[PDB]
Amino acid sequence: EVETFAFQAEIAQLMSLIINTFYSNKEIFLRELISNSSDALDKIRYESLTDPSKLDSGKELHINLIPNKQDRTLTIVDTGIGMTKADLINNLGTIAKSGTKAFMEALQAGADISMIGQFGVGFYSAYLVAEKVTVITKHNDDEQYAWESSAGGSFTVRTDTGEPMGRGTKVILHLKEDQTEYLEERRIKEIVKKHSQFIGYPITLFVE
């Protein structure tokens, strides 16, 4: 069943900072998560220009936004390259130790939280609006895994059973009680239009 890991001290810190720092422009979380999905989809793309059997786990390269009012969740699904178990543990494939260093320094020197994606740690912006984040992932080589964290210094990794996905990553944001605006069609559309309107892959906003 479930393995528990300690975040590296630098990530544990960034996350406390993201969670605790007063910052009203929370919406940038969606641009950062769509920008990582797009990066993951560029990667599966690049790979398949030399090995087309890579697209056998699925040819459609896209991004879905799925809000669920009853579960209070907003899910970003992509059919990107996915992460193997080691990717997920090595904090979701990021240089997060060195990025938090560069980021926390960039903040000292006049940056604001909205620039987080320049240091390749934009994922953690999910903790502006979510109390809990589950990342379900499937890379061609490996199993389907679930990663989960409610911050506080640890995360879990397990094998995910059932809901097979073929290839990619889902980020499920369990929203905080007072960030439910991010479940509204109108607000999601406004934010994609403000910050993500020239992404290179179709983004579909699901209706409830």
Ligand X SMILES: CSc1nc(-c2ccc(C)cc2C)c2c(C#N)c[nH]c2n1
Q: Which residues bind ligand X (CB under 6 A)?
A: 33, 36-37, 40, 78, 80-83, 91-94, 123, 135, 169, 171
Whole-number minimum distance, CB 194 to ligand X, in Å? Answer: 19
Which lies closer to ligand X via its Cβ, residue 133 or residue 183? 133
Quickly tell me which residue has 């889902």 as its tokens: 170
- In whole angstroms, give the CA distance from residue 80 to residue 87: 14
Whole-number minimum distance, CB 17 to ligand X, in Å? Answer: 15
Which lies closer to ligand X via its Cβ, residue 110 or residue 175? 175
Whole-number minimum distance, CB 120 to ligand X, in Å? Answer: 8
Whole-number minimum distance, CB 46 to ligand X, in Å? Answer: 12
Residue number with the smallest Cβ distance to ligand X: 92
Geometric angle at alpha carbon 86, from 82 and 143, rounded to 5°: 55
Q: Quick check: 41 and 78 in contact, CB under 8 A?
A: yes
Geometric angle at alpha carbon 77, from 75 and 83, rounded to 5°: 115
Which lies closer to ligand X via its Cβ, residue 169 or residue 179? 169
Which lies closer to ligand X via its Cβ, residue 186 or residue 200? 200
Query: Side chain identity at 34, as an amino acid letter?
Result: I
Question: What pairing do the DSSP bridges indicate for beta strands 203-205 and 63-68?
Answer: parallel
Annotated binding site for ATP: 36, 78, 97, 123
> Smallest Cα–Cα separation from 77: which of 182, 169, 139?
169
Annotated binding site: 36, 78, 97, 123
